Amino acid sequence: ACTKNAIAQTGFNKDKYFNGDVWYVTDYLDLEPDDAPKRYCAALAAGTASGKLKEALYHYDPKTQDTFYDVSELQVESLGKYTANFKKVDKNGNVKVAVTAGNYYTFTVMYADDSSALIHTCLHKGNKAAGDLYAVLNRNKDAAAGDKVKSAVSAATLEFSKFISTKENNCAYDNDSLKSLLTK
Ligand code: HEM
């Protein structure tokens, strides 16, 4: 089950975060034992498309090759805290699994600057358990976590040493599909 009421960044700059560009997950922390593989690739685009706040997600397990995209419509709960639906889509935005009640995630931006961010998400999918996830993001897929984001991890009373890096997994991303999925 999820247990964290993540606190959004003071003074969060929504237009800078939701600028239409891509964020790569460089490190992740799942608080639920065996919720996450040990090796993963994930990225997201975030932007406003025709007045609607959107995310597009990509997940890839580099061992199994399991791959899926989602597009998400975000509703605002407060500054930097959202509830997102999700429909599963192919990389061109064709619907595979429609939006349905009880498929949603919460999404909280705990820290962000122009290049890095720390987020929390609680995924609810049907009758699946939930679970908390933290992710360190960067605009550069190859960037080591720096001092602004590692300090934010400590300020959230977390240990960065507990986070699992995605860097040793040869992750390759279709940035074009993530950007175009924002419109879908
Ligand atoms: C970047 C932030 C992330 C968000 C917002 C997020 C959101 C989601 C959503 C919405 C789904 C369900 C998709 C669908 O069924 O259509 C999902 C599934 C999944 N995510 Fe994430 N995810 C994120 C990052 C990650 C990371 C970094 C990992 C682990 C390394 C991870 C592991 C998983 C796994 C294993 C599933 C499959 C769950 C299942 O159906 O049994 N996710 N995620």
Question: What are the extents of the domains in the chain?
Answer: 1-184
CA Rg value for the chain: 15
The response to whether 120 counts as a known ligand-binding position is no
Phi and psi, residue 153, nearest 5°: -60, -45
- Structure-solving method: X-ray
CATH architecture of 1-184: Beta Barrel (2.40)
DSSP 178: H
Cα 58 to ligand 1 centroid, rounded to whole Å = 8
Residue 1: how many CB atoms within 10 A of its CB? Answer: 9
Phi and psi, residue 14, nearest 5°: -65, -40
Q: Report the SS3 class of residue 98.
A: coil
What is the CB-side half-sphere exposure of residue 127 using CA atoms within 13 A? Answer: 0
Q: Work out the widest C-alpha separation in the chain, in whole angstroms.
A: 40
125 Cβ inside 6 Å of ligand 1: yes
Which residue has the CA at smallest separation from atom 3 of ligand 1?
121
